[PDB]
Design an enzyme around this catalytic site. Structure first.
Site, mmCIF file in Angstrom:
data_model
loop_
_atom_site.group_PDB
_atom_site.id
_atom_site.type_symbol
_atom_site.label_atom_id
_atom_site.label_comp_id
_atom_site.label_asym_id
_atom_site.label_seq_id
_atom_site.Cartn_x
_atom_site.Cartn_y
_atom_site.Cartn_z
ATOM 1 N N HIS A 68 0.831 -1.209 0.000
ATOM 2 C CA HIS A 68 0.000 0.000 0.000
ATOM 3 C C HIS A 68 0.870 1.265 0.000
ATOM 4 O O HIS A 68 0.830 2.083 0.917
ATOM 5 C CB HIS A 68 -0.969 -0.024 1.178
ATOM 6 C CG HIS A 68 -2.015 -1.104 1.089
ATOM 7 N ND1 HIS A 68 -1.943 -2.278 1.811
ATOM 8 C CD2 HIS A 68 -3.152 -1.191 0.351
ATOM 9 C CE1 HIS A 68 -2.988 -3.033 1.531
ATOM 10 N NE2 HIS A 68 -3.737 -2.400 0.647
ATOM 11 N N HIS A 72 0.886 1.624 -5.801
ATOM 12 C CA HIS A 72 -0.467 1.074 -5.804
ATOM 13 C C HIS A 72 -1.508 2.150 -6.094
ATOM 14 O O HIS A 72 -2.480 1.894 -6.818
ATOM 15 C CB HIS A 72 -0.721 0.368 -4.466
ATOM 16 C CG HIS A 72 -2.138 -0.048 -4.234
ATOM 17 N ND1 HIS A 72 -2.702 -1.143 -4.843
ATOM 18 C CD2 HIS A 72 -3.090 0.457 -3.417
ATOM 19 C CE1 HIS A 72 -3.943 -1.294 -4.417
ATOM 20 N NE2 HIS A 72 -4.207 -0.329 -3.556
ATOM 21 N N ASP A 107 -5.495 5.364 -0.443
ATOM 22 C CA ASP A 107 -4.736 4.686 0.606
ATOM 23 C C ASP A 107 -3.691 5.605 1.229
ATOM 24 O O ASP A 107 -2.609 5.163 1.628
ATOM 25 C CB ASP A 107 -4.035 3.435 0.075
ATOM 26 C CG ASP A 107 -4.974 2.273 -0.179
ATOM 27 O OD1 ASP A 107 -5.781 1.915 0.704
ATOM 28 O OD2 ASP A 107 -4.852 1.690 -1.266
ATOM 29 N N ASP A 217 -9.109 -1.359 -7.092
ATOM 30 C CA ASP A 217 -8.269 -1.702 -5.948
ATOM 31 C C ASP A 217 -7.625 -3.071 -6.109
ATOM 32 O O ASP A 217 -6.436 -3.241 -5.807
ATOM 33 C CB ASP A 217 -9.092 -1.646 -4.653
ATOM 34 C CG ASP A 217 -8.233 -1.334 -3.419
ATOM 35 O OD1 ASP A 217 -7.065 -0.950 -3.632
ATOM 36 O OD2 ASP A 217 -8.736 -1.457 -2.268
ATOM 37 N N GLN A 269 -4.649 -18.143 -3.001
ATOM 38 C CA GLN A 269 -4.835 -17.314 -4.182
ATOM 39 C C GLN A 269 -6.004 -17.807 -5.024
ATOM 40 O O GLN A 269 -6.745 -16.993 -5.585
ATOM 41 C CB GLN A 269 -3.545 -17.255 -5.006
ATOM 42 C CG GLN A 269 -2.578 -16.160 -4.526
ATOM 43 C CD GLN A 269 -3.261 -14.818 -4.494
ATOM 44 O OE1 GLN A 269 -3.366 -14.152 -5.516
ATOM 45 N NE2 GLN A 269 -3.776 -14.435 -3.333
HETATM 46 C C1 DZU Z 1 -2.329 -19.110 2.822
HETATM 47 C C2 DZU Z 1 -3.444 -18.136 2.526
HETATM 48 C C3 DZU Z 1 -4.719 -18.327 3.066
HETATM 49 C C4 DZU Z 1 -5.758 -17.435 2.828
HETATM 50 C C5 DZU Z 1 -5.502 -16.355 2.010
HETATM 51 C C6 DZU Z 1 -4.258 -16.127 1.450
HETATM 52 C C7 DZU Z 1 -3.218 -17.024 1.725
HETATM 53 N N1 DZU Z 1 -4.276 -15.042 0.574
HETATM 54 C C8 DZU Z 1 -5.528 -14.631 0.614
HETATM 55 C C9 DZU Z 1 -5.993 -13.406 -0.007
HETATM 56 C C10 DZU Z 1 -5.171 -12.458 -0.437
HETATM 57 C C11 DZU Z 1 -5.568 -11.109 -0.843
HETATM 58 C C12 DZU Z 1 -6.272 -10.298 0.025
HETATM 59 C C13 DZU Z 1 -6.709 -9.037 -0.346
HETATM 60 C C14 DZU Z 1 -6.456 -8.555 -1.594
HETATM 61 C C15 DZU Z 1 -5.736 -9.334 -2.534
HETATM 62 C C16 DZU Z 1 -5.441 -8.916 -3.846
HETATM 63 C C17 DZU Z 1 -4.737 -9.730 -4.676
HETATM 64 C C18 DZU Z 1 -4.318 -10.961 -4.206
HETATM 65 N N2 DZU Z 1 -4.566 -11.423 -2.995
HETATM 66 C C19 DZU Z 1 -5.282 -10.614 -2.153
HETATM 67 N N3 DZU Z 1 -6.338 -15.391 1.427
HETATM 68 C C20 DZU Z 1 -7.752 -15.635 1.403
HETATM 69 C C21 DZU Z 1 -8.389 -15.921 0.210
HETATM 70 C C22 DZU Z 1 -9.765 -16.051 0.170
HETATM 71 C C23 DZU Z 1 -10.527 -15.816 1.295
HETATM 72 C C24 DZU Z 1 -9.901 -15.432 2.466
HETATM 73 O O1 DZU Z 1 -10.931 -15.040 3.293
HETATM 74 C C25 DZU Z 1 -10.632 -14.539 4.602
HETATM 75 C C26 DZU Z 1 -11.731 -13.556 4.965
HETATM 76 C C27 DZU Z 1 -11.458 -12.132 4.484
HETATM 77 N N4 DZU Z 1 -12.584 -11.467 3.808
HETATM 78 C C28 DZU Z 1 -13.548 -10.925 4.772
HETATM 79 C C29 DZU Z 1 -12.903 -9.845 5.621
HETATM 80 N N5 DZU Z 1 -12.401 -8.754 4.787
HETATM 81 C C30 DZU Z 1 -11.767 -7.718 5.615
HETATM 82 C C31 DZU Z 1 -11.456 -9.283 3.804
HETATM 83 C C32 DZU Z 1 -12.102 -10.371 2.958
HETATM 84 C C33 DZU Z 1 -8.514 -15.387 2.550
HETATM 85 MG MG MG Z 2 -7.356 0.737 1.809
HETATM 86 ZN ZN ZN Z 3 -5.979 0.168 -2.099
#
Ligand code: DZU
Ligand code: MG
Ligand code: ZN
Length: 312
Positions: A68, A72, A107, A217, A269
């Site tokens: 961030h 970005h 951000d 985003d 992912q």
């Molecule tokens: C080993 C591992 C395990 C879980 C991981 C993980 C790695 N990476 C992610 C997600 C990488 C991520 C997060 C945010 C934005 C990206 C943009 C591009 C790429 N990736 C990412 N997650 C993941 C993927 C899918 C669902 C997940 O849900 C957890 C709950 C979170 N929800 C609900 C709560 N709000 C705040 C966020 C979204 C978590």
């Molecule tokens: Mg933000």
């Molecule tokens: Zn952002």
């Protein structure tokens, strides 16, 4: 000297692709944002002098965090340009400019820590801003640079137009709070389903914008596979940092934030593309069908993460 910038001729076209990577053009990035504002809002939409001031100060006010950061803001800035250039008679002038500003600022002064971290450990920020904590801050930062002298680019326009571009900007910044995004995308779905959308409805346009902001985003996942892969490394280097200090406060961080679970990054992912990323760009395509390439690339990267997991 940001006023003396001119963008290379060979780029003019490449910028217009949704999949475009700003990565290798670091010196040009503020002029890249200048270029984009002058193509979808026109030159002489701001006074040049104060638009270059407002830009480099926003750069100044992004931290040296892994993800961030300044890179970005501009990447998201680009995605917004791409969507408005493929939808241009839909969005007014005060949307097109407000949203390019909003993205570049969304951000501001991130410290690389999650809303929950702030909320979990009684940060001063989650005391002022109880829900959607960093976004209420990013909008407080944004106003703060506007109200500097030689910085108010909206100043030469009506105060009724000035408060509108404030309130458009606020929402889009808050919308980047992924926790609200879920309700927004599911609500948009029904209104599509039931044929109850109405782009004349100012509260329906507000939702549709917020969808666009989430797509912008998350747009790292809409690049060619080498670009997307190398951005994951930035994303987890920040998540992992927030994990780390949780391991110093005795607590086991969630797997997403656990460096010692690296072998599950491909797995999550896929779970992230299927639980957030495909849903997001799917609805945004049903709504703005010219933005289907965002959808197609996200699917392409899903295939790759599939191929990592399988070792195929
Ligand atoms: C080993 C591992 C395990 C879980 C991981 C993980 C790695 N990476 C992610 C997600 C990488 C991520 C997060 C945010 C934005 C990206 C943009 C591009 C790429 N990736 C990412 N997650 C993941 C993927 C899918 C669902 C997940 O849900 C957890 C709950 C979170 N929800 C609900 C709560 N709000 C705040 C966020 C979204 C978590
Ligand atoms: Mg933000
Ligand atoms: Zn952002």
């Amino acid at each position: 000297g940001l006023m003396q910038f001119t963008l290379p001729v060979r780029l003019c076209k490449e910028i217009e692709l949704f999949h475009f990577d700003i990565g290798p053009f670091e010196n040009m990035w503020p002029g890249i944002f200048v270029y984009m504002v002058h193509r979808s809002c026109g030159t002489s939409c701001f006074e040049l002098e104060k638009l270059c001031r407002f830009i480099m100060s926003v750069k100044k006010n992004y931290r040296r965090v892994p993800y961030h950061n300044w890179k970005h803001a501009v990447t998201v800035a680009h995605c917004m340009y791409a969507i408005l250039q493929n939808n241009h008679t839909l969005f007014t002038d005060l949307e097109r400019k407000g949203l390019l500003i909003a993205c570049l600022c969304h951000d501001l002064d991130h410290r690389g820590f999650s809303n929950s971290y702030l909320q979990k450990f009684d940060h001063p920020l989650a005391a002022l801003y109880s829900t959607s904590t960093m976004e209420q801050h990013h909008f407080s930062q944004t106003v703060s640079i506007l109200q500097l002298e030689g910085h108010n680019i909206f100043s030469t326009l009506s105060s009724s137009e000035y408060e509108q571009v404030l309130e458009i900007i606020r929402k889009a910044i808050i919308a980047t709070d992924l926790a609200l995004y879920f309700g927004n995308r599911k609500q948009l779905e029904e209104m599509y389903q039931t044929g109850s959308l109405n782009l004349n409805n100012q509260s329906h346009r507000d939702r549709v914008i917020g969808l666009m902001m989430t797509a912008c985003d998350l747009c790292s996942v809409t690049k060619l596979w080498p670009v997307t892969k190398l951005t994951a490394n930035d994303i987890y280097a920040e998540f992992w940092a927030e994990g780390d200090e949780m391991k110093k406060l005795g607590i086991q961080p969630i797997p997403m934030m656990d460096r010692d679970k690296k072998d599950e990054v491909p797995q999550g992912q896929l779970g992230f593309y299927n639980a957030v990323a495909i849903p997001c760009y799917t609805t945004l395509t049903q709504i703005l069908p010219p933005t289907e390439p965002l959808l197609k690339a996200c699917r392409d990267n899903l295939s790759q993460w599939e191929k990592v997991i399988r070792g195929e």
